DNA sequence: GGAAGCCATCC
DNA sequence: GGATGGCTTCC
């Protein structure tokens, strides 16, 4: 009826886009002709077009541009084993990409937005009378019209793939292999490149930045992303892929999977009284935001005592082990050990805390300090812990309080046995 | 599912070009699956000439580099990538792109054959160290001997022997020498934990392994609330596609003699944590068991909580 | 083109020059007469993209000024001299105070928040009293940023406020964030006439304000009490 | 003839 | 910058 009517409007409008680029020679005559031939069979022309054109989901082509093989649009079942991360999570609010030809993109796109308006982006298999009232198309135009939709609608592919896919093998148990090949999903990540970019960029984003910035705090989110990786998909022209690839830029955001210390940074390890001094505090940057953590969870009610207890069980456990990991690494990062120039307290703690008895160090000195191994700087170290934590007597009056001080006292126990067992 | 005899250290593991990327939503370290590749061909390369059969892997990624650079106007980063040869015209190649690292790492392996029976322990670990000595593991080829001759020697340690308190010294000894690497694990069990308590919100699946892991700043009621652990998602391994095909009935296979189908990767969320805040040393191999009747198919480290 | 965000201006630096083969400019960013940051920013950035450059160290100074220039807080303690029962934020001192610690013979006390206190002892009439006429507005800070005397009550010492002065509190980029037409209807005048104050120099076509639209107007804003 | 090759034009 | 072809366009 009207959408019929509307194509015929952007047909005009497609003409007189082509008209805009007009030649002074022959350009007239040409594109009266053009608009005369587009207005007389736009159909007849875009059945050809849309008989060229396949919808899909996963596509071989961003492994490499040279390569062709299986593409498939298809929507795999939920897993058994619970907890995954699959296109079976959403169904409803999907976007398939396309692969084809250029012209015949603009055909598929003139097709789908003739499926806009009413409800011909579902009903393009069912419907006759209205959509040959509107476009001008005859009984057999449309029939033909709806053949080729029903067609360019389906896959239309042979089972093959390419020679550089990845194609791996995975054992089986207790027998052989199969071949595996992936598949580059394209729609998921459409899915998650507007999810990002809307986490990114929005009026309730900067809004809740600006929100930050004042410290105003209406009912709100934030949410924040650190480090992403950049890749870029083939040359300068993104739409090779699909037009999603056109409106992506060829452009994918990749998520942080590091290990925790990826800034291999130099160790201060050498021998300063002040640095000493510093060293026995340890302020480092993951040191320095557990410590305001810790120094911001003090002043936390009792009613989530439970939770607030295992947020605290796990925070200190979590500020032992980094501690216990920051000397192994000062250890092991230590090359030789040097005897300090006024390393106050840096010696008594190194005794224990520093690395072997070498050539710079004494024999006799190595062997007093294989003697003795160093309960009292696991001393100094509980105490320098718990002057770092902010303690008061609402603690001391509390029983929370009390069982946190017990919970620190085994972390602290459970820190010096782990020490007097590599020590000595 | 089976517990094996002894355990196998490979001491110190340098690489240089190893895979970066390895996945198509991350880029950090290369997946576990790679690992369990490797001690599977390992396997097809000496240890059925040994009697001898290997099970799982144990890994701590002593220290880590990556080719990466930040692009001065933003808080993104570009790969690295090198120059392929020219075209046949001698015009210009195309651009794929590629992520190159160098790791170090040390890998713990078990063994169910007759370890000490057929042949001594440590000619055993040092005939498995001079074969694995050839290979590679993520594209990355394994750099040789270095001046460090000190990691030069393996260890080969019988988990059940002795008493209780043997075992412990044994194993206490054996993490001496694995510092200051960080053991990785699977979390699918607090992952399942929190999608219950955010399905208290709303129904919503991959949304869950998205927010787990970000920087989320919540409002004064400026406060950032924490996970207790270094969570970092990791590619939990594969679901169908297709059916599964005969082994001559799909073109250009590397071998025609093997079945074939079409998967899409399955993704989960796993934790770095040292070794010392575990007490059995065999909670930490990763095992790759398929299921082919469904697409589950599936690496992970069971018997580890 | 100089940008002007309250009492702040970016200015350009009159000639390019070539970084790393690309046209680029030098920026400054001033508040008043004093210079305070100098960019380096390449051409075919909008004036939003200059705009947000400096959007963080702008807001930073918000914050500094805001913490410095705080107001004094009062609170209400019973006959121990612990638990505070209400705090209130003052714009003066009710100049009765001498130091005191609180003991028995009365149930309610009025101590300040600083160390060495001088408190009084009240009895919860006069202390509705004092809070309702010594209390301050929301915006008491902005008061510290201005002259003194341009803020005086009496006559004879004010005079009219400039036009960098008045846009401290009127204007989309002043501290209270309320515009010019919303400032002409708190006053019930035209737009045009409002914005006849805002012109620059007073040879340009502008008038100085009066005193009791200048004095009514930090009322209304909550900015100056104005009793 | 048929293929391949190049160029070309589309998006 | 991949895709398809159309008149040329060799041998």
Redesign the interface.
């Known amino acids: 009826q009207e959408l019929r009517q509307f194509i015929e409007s952007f047909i005009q409008e497609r003409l007189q886009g082509k008209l805009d680029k007009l030649h002074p020679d022959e350009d007239d005559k040409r594109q009266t002709l053009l608009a005369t031939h587009r207005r007389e069979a736009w159909l007849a022309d875009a059945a050809r077009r849309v008989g060229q054109l396949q919808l899909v989901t996963h596509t071989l082509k961003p492994i490499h541009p040279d390569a062709r093989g299986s593409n498939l649009h298809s929507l795999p079942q939920a897993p058994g084993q619970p907890g995954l991360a699959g296109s079976h999570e959403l169904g409803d609010r999907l976007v398939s990409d396309v692969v084809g030809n250029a012209a015949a993109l603009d055909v598929f796109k003139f097709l789908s937005l003739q499926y806009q308006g009413k409800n011909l982006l579902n009903w393009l298999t069912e419907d006759s009378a209205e959509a040959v009232q509107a476009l001008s198309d005859n009984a057999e135009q449309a029939r033909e019209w709806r053949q080729a939709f029903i067609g360019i609608t389906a896959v239309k592919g042979a089972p093959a793939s390419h020679s550089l896919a990845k194609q791996l093998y995975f054992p089986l148990p207790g027998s052989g292999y199969h071949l595996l090949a992936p598949l580059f999903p394209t729609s998921l990540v459409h899915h998650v490149h507007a999810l990002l970019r809307e986490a990114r960029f929005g009026d309730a984003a900067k809004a809740a930045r600006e929100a930050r910035s004042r410290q105003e705090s209406w009912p709100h989110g934030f949410s924040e992303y650190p480090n992403l990786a950049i890749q870029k998909f083939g040359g300068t022209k993104p739409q090779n892929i699909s037009q999603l690839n056109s409106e992506r830029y060829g452009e994918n955001w990749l998520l942080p999977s590091l290990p925790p210390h990826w800034q291999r940074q130099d160790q201060r390890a050498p021998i300063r009284h002040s640095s000493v001094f510093e060293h026995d505090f340890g302020r480092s940057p993951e040191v320095s935001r557990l410590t305001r953590t810790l120094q911001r969870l003090l002043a936390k009610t009792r009613h989530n005592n439970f939770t607030i207890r295992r947020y605290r069980a796990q925070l200190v456990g979590q500020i032992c082990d980094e501690a216990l990991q920051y000397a192994a690494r000062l250890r092991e990062l230590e090359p030789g050990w040097s005897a300090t120039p006024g390393c106050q307290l840096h010696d008594a703690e190194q005794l224990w805390l520093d690395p072997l008895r070498a050539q710079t160090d004494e024999t006799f000195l190595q062997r007093r300090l294989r003697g003795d191994w160093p309960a009292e700087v696991g001393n100094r170290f509980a105490n320098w812990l718990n002057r770092a934590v902010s303690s008061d007597s609402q603690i001391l009056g509390s029983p929370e309080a009390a069982q946190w001080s017990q919970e620190l006292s085994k972390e602290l126990t459970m820190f010096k046995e782990i020490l007097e067992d590599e020590r000595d | 599912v089976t517990d094996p005899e002894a355990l196998l250290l490979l001491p110190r593991l340098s690489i240089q070009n190893a895979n970066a990327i390895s996945s198509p939503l991350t880029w950090g370290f290369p997946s576990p699956g790679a690992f369990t590749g490797f001690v599977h061909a390992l396997q097809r390369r000496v240890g059925i000439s040994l009697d001898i059969e290997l099970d799982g892997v144990g890994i701590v990624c002593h220290r880590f580099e990556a080719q990466i650079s930040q692009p001065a106007g933003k808080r993104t980063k570009v790969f690295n990538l090198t120059r392929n040869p020219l075209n046949r015209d001698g015009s210009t190649a195309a651009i794929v792109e590629e992520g190159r690292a160098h790791l170090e790492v040390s890998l713990l392996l078990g063994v169910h054959g007759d370890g000490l029976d057929d042949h001594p322990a440590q000619e055993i670990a040092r005939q498995v160290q001079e074969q694995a000595g050839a290979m590679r593991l993520a594209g990355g080829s394994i750099l040789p001997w270095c001046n460090e001759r000190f990691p030069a020697p393996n260890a080969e340690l019988l988990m059940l022997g002795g008493s209780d308190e043997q075992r412990r010294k044994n194993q206490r000894r054996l993490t001496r020498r694995l510092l200051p690497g960080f053991a990785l694990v699977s979390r699918e069990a607090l992952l399942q934990q929190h999608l219950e308590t955010l399905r208290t919100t709303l129904p919503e699946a991959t949304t869950l392994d998205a927010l787990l892991d970000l920087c989320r700043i919540n409002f004064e009621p400026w406060q950032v609330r924490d996970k207790p652990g270094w969570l970092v998602p990791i590619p939990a391994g594969y679901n169908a596609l297709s059916p599964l095909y005969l082994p001559g009935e799909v073109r250009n296979a590397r071998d025609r003699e093997t079945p074939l189908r079409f998967v899409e990767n399955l993704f989960g969320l796993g934790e770095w944590l040292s070794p010392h805040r575990v007490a059995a040393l065999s909670d930490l191999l990763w095992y790759h068991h398929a299921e082919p009747d469904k697409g589950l198919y599936r690496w992970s480290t069971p018997r580890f909580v | 083109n100089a940008i002007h965000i309250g009492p702040f201006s970016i200015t350009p630096a009159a000639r390019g020059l070539h970084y790393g083969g690309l046209p680029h400019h030098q920026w400054t960013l001033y508040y008043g007469p004093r210079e305070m940051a100098i960019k380096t920013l390449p051409d075919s950035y909008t004036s939003s993209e200059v705009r947000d450059e400096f959007?963080?160290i702008i807001?930073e100074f918000?914050i500094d000024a805001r913490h410095r220039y705080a107001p004094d807080v009062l609170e209400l303690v019973n006959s121990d001299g612990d638990a505070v029962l209400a705090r209130v934020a003052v714009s003066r001192l009710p100049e009765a105070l001498s130091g005191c610690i609180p003991d028995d013979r009365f149930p309610y006390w009025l101590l300040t928040a600083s160390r060495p206190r001088l408190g009084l002892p009240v009895t919860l009439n006069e202390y509705t009293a004092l809070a309702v006429e010594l209390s301050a507005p929301p915006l008491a800070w902005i008061t510290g940023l201005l002259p003194g005397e341009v803020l005086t009550h009496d006559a004879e010492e004010w005079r009219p406020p400039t036009s960098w002065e008045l846009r401290h509190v009127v204007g989309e980029g002043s501290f209270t964030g309320v515009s010019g037409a919303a400032a002409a209807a708190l006053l019930g005048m035209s737009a045009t006439n409002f914005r006849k104050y805002t012109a620059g120099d007073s040879a340009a076509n502008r008038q100085k304000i009066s005193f009791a639209a200048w004095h009514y107007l930090l009322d209304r804003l909550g900015v100056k009490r104005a009793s």
């Open positions: 959007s963080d807001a918000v």
